[PDB]
Symmetry: C3
Amino acid sequence: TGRPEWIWLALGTALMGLGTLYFLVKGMGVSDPDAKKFYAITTLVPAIAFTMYLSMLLGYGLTMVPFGGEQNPIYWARYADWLFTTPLLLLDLALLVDADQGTILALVGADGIMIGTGLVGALTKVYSYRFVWWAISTAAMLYILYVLFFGVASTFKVLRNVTVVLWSAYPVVWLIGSEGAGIVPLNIETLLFMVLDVSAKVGFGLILLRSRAIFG
Amino acid sequence: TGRPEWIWLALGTALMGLGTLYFLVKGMGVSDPDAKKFYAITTLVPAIAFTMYLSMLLGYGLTMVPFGGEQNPIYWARYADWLFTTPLLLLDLALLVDADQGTILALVGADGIMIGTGLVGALTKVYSYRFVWWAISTAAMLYILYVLFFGVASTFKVLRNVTVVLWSAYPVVWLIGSEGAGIVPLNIETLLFMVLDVSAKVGFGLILLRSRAIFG
Amino acid sequence: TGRPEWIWLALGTALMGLGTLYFLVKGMGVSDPDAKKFYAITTLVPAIAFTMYLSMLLGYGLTMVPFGGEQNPIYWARYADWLFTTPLLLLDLALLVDADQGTILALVGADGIMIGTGLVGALTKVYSYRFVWWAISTAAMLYILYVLFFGVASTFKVLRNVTVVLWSAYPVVWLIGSEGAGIVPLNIETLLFMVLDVSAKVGFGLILLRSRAIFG
Ligand SMILES: *C\C=C(C)/C=C/C=C(C)/C=C/C1=C(C)CCCC1(C)C
Ligand SMILES: *C\C=C(C)/C=C/C=C(C)/C=C/C1=C(C)CCCC1(C)C
Ligand SMILES: *C\C=C(C)/C=C/C=C(C)/C=C/C1=C(C)CCCC1(C)C
């Protein structure tokens, strides 16, 4: 359609949907409560993302934000997506290592500030302030990674580093993309987030559910 | 007032308020933690709905959505209502049959997508796409009913079928009402949702709390 | 800047940030899961508030609401703040006295209606109706205080009365401030909420975390 990035949105929609179907079928039959837990969590994340990519695709999860003298398309549904899926992803790690509740709360808590401040950064009309919110969000992401390292083992370790490399990519792509300094066109900005999202929402899950660590 | 549907909104407000008072008084004295749980859950649901019908009544939870060439009044507060009460209703069943946590999460998870996609459907300006969101929401509702059947007993069974007949009514009324194909005037569309809501928010609760199944 | 209340917003930002840092450092080393719980909860609350005061300061969490024939600046981010921090504050008391789950739910449930109805009151364009929402919110606050009194001991008692005096201040300041009857200028309205917020978000926490009651 009229938006260059549409094919990336259409591809992410498709891959999230297929990933959703795949885990739904994969999950059928699980009777082990613990495994049930990782299956629910892991199936729900691309289901949520599927509906969010579709709203972006259909143009509903998109808005225009004025700044830098320009009218700027902002996909707010990306953040609405992360707002619900990043805490579940952290839930999978939590459950893996059996984190106690104060840690889980701090994690989930830091994550909501991460995405909420980043959504504020996204919608802020004062150009310079957007980077203030990028900074606080990035600070929160770093606390989350800090806990992950200093706050099953082998699978945990695997998903941990996947997480590091994947989650730390989101900050840069924000910065260089159209929501930030405006280094890379929106069209390529959407492509990168799609590739991260699918790796984080489907790839991560394939890696976790194919492991016996999820089993009591 | 100026809106035909006002008397239905005023009636739902009144019935939810009275239902709220009734359970609040009913609940006083409960010392059994488990029963306490069903009382809180069941009292909270019409309290939330009371405030939401009032915002609709007062006109705050109402907006106009353009599509089909027309400006269309949409009661978004209906969805804000279901967003918080449908998961608690599912909580009551969950607690009844002592569902494990992976099931509860999948249930609560599918329910949030159900109402969120249906709210997107409600606010979408592209006529044809609204039905796409109706379809995904309906798909999620069907997963929720699927779990309910394939995922205390007697009371469970009773509330289960009440749930089936009541929840499956919401899809049709969306379709034929003004938010969809536009078969039934808004005025009658509001009347039907009010009747469902009160049966689902008060009737359901009367049935559950009058049972000893809620007792350890 | 152009807004008189800015210095109060800047002061609250600063005090919440410093309070956040202070507990973060204070919390380092805690290994006792229960204590971990009060530390997470208590550190998260001014972190959330920090980001919300900053959005108010920067002007992002501010909007204009028409009523009384005038265009009226409303800091909606104040409510977005309370929406997440008041339930955690109640969590600290809950955990103190080891409230059972039906109580916690009723508490958290009444609190969300409290702030949500008060946010509706804040954004309502019909002058007289704002006070209807003030009334329902106040009713919910009273239920929350009722439970607190009729629904560790010594610390509980201390935080309980702090809570009473602090939380009951918010209703009056709404009433006399610019969001209500318009008795006190916005500039002083913001000052009072800042003083309450910092006492409720930092002061309360200093009092709780300096106690051994948080320890198993
Ligand atoms: C959809 C799955 C995941 C794993 C998404 C993770 C996204 C983030 C870690 C985003 C972080 C951001 C930061 C650190 C600062 C700028 C705003 C963002 C929200 C993009
Ligand atoms: C207030 C109480 C209940 C039991 C409400 C239940 C509502 C639904 C099951 C709504 C479902 C919808 C579907 C399936 C698709 C169109 C949009 C709706 C949200 C109306
Ligand atoms: C930030 C910390 C706390 C302890 C804030 C508490 C705020 C309230 C108790 C607010 C209550 C309100 C009432 C009772 C009615 C009018 C609207 C308010 C939301 C201000």
